[PDB]
């Protein structure tokens, strides 16, 4: 037995390999010099579309998180700039993304930073939601708490987060999944940020779909995107309804 730190995956994250079994695991080194909540949240998780948590180890000042190694890399690296990826592949990743998000929201957890860098792939190209450093509990004892903290990455963040003092957690993760779908299908992010001062975002609200990235997207998935990227979070489509959408259920090969 004994693990070797073979290389840098991305503190930092190193790839550890068992000297006997040759089994691998990602080790996240968190120089505490987030983390507490991240370990806590990780302990509650167990789902095939969420990066597995093996355990942790303080060992002084460097906190060590032991996480599932995803040999396929980041979804981010499967997206060709300006092109996207084949629709069938994007749909399968999107189905898997919704499976992971339904699970998280089911146990009252919001990820808050969904984007392709945080969606990793295993050996069989199964999507795994990664990094719970920004995650939080939005439901406890069956009572929902509204969020107010600015968390996320601008291009993927929901507009309410920039405009409202308080907002529901779930539609924010739905929105970020819609920007991920756009990136998969167009190899392009639609706007720097979702604010009226951003020309691209204003054009979308005025339905100028003849512009990029929308023009590269087929009408069926674009119809789903019209339901997800709705400014008013109360009017935005919910996950159960996304799962009933026409494109979501279209057979593709
Ligand atoms: C068409 C080729 C350009 C594609 C780039 S892709 C991109 N832009 C980013 C811009 C800001 C932050 C992160 C990214 C990023 O991760 N990607 C990125 C790169 C590769 C893969 C992935 Cl998933 C993301 C893009 O969408 N924009 C940069 C150029 C101008 C924008 C303005 C908004 C309207 N679309 C074009 C945004």
Swiss-Prot record:
**Localization per record:** Nucleus; Chromosome; Cytoplasm; Cytoplasm, Cytoskeleton, Microtubule organizing center, Centrosome
Domain of life here? Eukaryota
Which residues carry out catalysis? 113 (proton acceptor)
Q: Can you supply one Gene Ontology CC term for this chain's record?
A: chromatin
PTM section of the record: Phosphorylated by ATR in a RAD17-dependent manner in response to ultraviolet irradiation and inhibition of DNA replication. Phosphorylated by ATM in response to ionizing irradiation.
An MF annotation (GO) of this entry: protein serine kinase activity
Q: Does the keyword Aminoacyl-tRNA synthetase apply?
A: no
Q: By what means is the activity of this protein regulated?
A: Activated through phosphorylation predominantly by ATR but also by ATM in response to DNA damage or inhibition of DNA replication. Activation is modulated by several mediators including CLSPN, BRCA1 and FEM1B. Proteolytic cleavage at the C-terminus by SPRTN during normal DNA replication activates the protein kinase activity.
User: Is Cell membrane found in the keyword set?
Assistant: no
Write out the catalysed reaction.
L-seryl-[protein] + ATP = O-phospho-L-seryl-[protein] + ADP + H(+); L-threonyl-[protein] + ATP = O-phospho-L-threonyl-[protein] + ADP + H(+)
Question: Could you tell me the keywords of this UniProt record?
Answer: ATP-binding, Cell cycle, Chromosome, Cytoplasm, Cytoskeleton, Disease variant, DNA damage, DNA repair, Isopeptide bond, Kinase, Nucleotide-binding, Nucleus, Phosphoprotein, Serine/threonine-protein kinase, Transferase, Ubl conjugation
Enzyme Commission number(s) from the entry: 2.7.11.1
The record lists the effect of residue 115 to R as: Strong reduction of chromatin-associated CHK1 ubiquitination
State the signal peptide span: none
Q: Where is this cross-link: Glycyl lysine isopeptide (Lys-Gly) (interchain with G-Cter in ubiquitin)?
A: 115
Chain positions covered by the region annotation Interaction with CLSPN:
1-248
Top EC class per UniProt? transferase
Q: What tissues is it present in?
A: Expressed ubiquitously with the most abundant expression in thymus, testis, small intestine and colon.
Subunit info?
Answer: Interacts (phosphorylated by ATR) with RAD51. Interacts with and phosphorylates CLSPN, an adapter protein that regulates the ATR-dependent phosphorylation of CHEK1. Interacts with BRCA1. Interacts with and phosphorylates CDC25A, CDC25B and CDC25C. Interacts with FBXO6, which regulates CHEK1. Interacts with PPM1D, which regulates CHEK1 through dephosphorylation. Interacts with TIMELESS; DNA damage-dependent. Interacts with FEM1B; activates CHEK1 in response to stress. Interacts with TLK1. Interacts with XPO1 and YWHAZ. Interacts with CDK5RAP3; antagonizes CHEK1.
Give the domain note: The autoinhibitory region (AIR) inhibits the activity of the kinase domain.
The disease tied to this protein in UniProt is:
Oocyte/zygote/embryo maturation arrest 21: An autosomal dominant, female infertility disorder characterized by zygote development arrest due to failure of pronuclei fusion.
This protein is called what?
Serine/threonine-protein kinase Chk1
Species the sequence originates in? Homo sapiens (Human)
Q: Name the gene for this chain.
A: CHEK1
Q: Which residues of the full protein are shown?
A: 7 to 270 of 476
């Amino acid at each position: 037995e004994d693990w070797d730190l073979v290389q840098t995956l991305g503190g930092e994250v190193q790839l550890a390999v068992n000297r006997v079994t040759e089994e691998a695991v990602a080790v996240k080194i968190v120089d505490m010099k987030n983390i507490k909540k991240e370990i806590c949240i990780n302990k509650m998780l167990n789902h095939e579309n969420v990066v597995k948590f093996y355990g942790h180890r303080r060992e002084g000042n460097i906190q060590y998180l032991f996480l599932e190694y995803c040999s396929g890399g980041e979804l981010f690296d499967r997206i060709e700039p300006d092109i996207g990826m084949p629709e069938p592949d994007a749909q399968r990743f999107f189905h898997q993304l919704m499976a992971g998000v339904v699970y998280l929201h089911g146990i009252g957890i919001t990820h808050r930073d969904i984007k392709p860098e945080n969606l990793l792939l295993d050996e069989r190209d199964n999507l795994k939601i990664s990094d719970f450093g920004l995650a939080t509990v939005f439901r406890y004892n069956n009572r929902e708490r509204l969020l107010n903290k600015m968390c996320g990455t601008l291009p993927y963040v929901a507009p309410e987060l920039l405009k409202r003092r308080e907002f529901h957690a779930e539609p924010v993760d739905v929105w970020s999944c819609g920007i991920v779908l756009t990136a998969m299908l167009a190899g392009e992010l639609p706007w720097d940020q979702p604010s009226d001062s951003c020309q691209e975002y204003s054009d979308w609200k005025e339905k100028k779909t003849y512009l990029n990235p929308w023009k590269k997207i087929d009408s069926a998935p674009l119809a789903l995107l019209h339901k997800i990227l709705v400014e008013n979070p109360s009017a935005r489509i919910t996950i159960p309804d996304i799962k009933k959408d026409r494109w979501y259920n279209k057979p593709l090969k």
